[PDB]
Assembly symmetry: C2
Homo-oligomer: 96 residues x 2
């Protein structure tokens, strides 16, 4: 599997306000091909947000990354910090 980790400068909303505002966005991610799950990350303290995504394959993950990076611009995000990694299943299974 492929893990996508992303974060970026963000000035809010955070917490329950973020959940309410970005609910539609979250639901749309579920319709993405190859998508398995996502953990939403946020740090009001450091003014940043992002997410950890698990995709079935790298191609699916890269396609989403490019698209989401474009979309993020509509929220005022000019730079996205992201890394694409392979997941080590054996080790991950032990720690889950």
């Amino acid at each position: 599997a492929t893990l996508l980790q992303l974060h970026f400068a963000f000035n809010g909303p955070f917490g329950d306000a973020m959940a309410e505002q970005l609910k539609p966005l979250a639901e749309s991610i579920n319709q993405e091909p190859g998508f398995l799950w996502k953990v939403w990350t946020e740090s009001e303290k450091n003014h940043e947000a992002g997410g950890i995504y698990l995709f079935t394959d790298e191609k699916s993950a890269l396609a989403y990354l490019e698209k989401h990076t474009a979309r993020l611009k509509n929220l005022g995000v000019e730079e996205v910090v992201a890394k694409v990694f392979d997941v080590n299943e054996p080790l991950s299974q032990i720690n889950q």
Copy 2:
């Protein structure tokens, strides 16, 4: 719930070789205070490795980060790129 995202330059082992080698390490992590789960990440083509961790609280996450970043020096890992984030539960539940 606090999420820890870490990665760093790495020269190996990778894949099953990594799974066999670090298996003992994965078992000890399960014993760490406040530990919930970890996803092992790796990229042989980019010569990098790391992990995504979930801890019950920030102090537990920060305690482990301090301990782990120090231990990694033994594997030759001089520097580590780390980020500590809060998790948005509502949105994360939608995407799982």
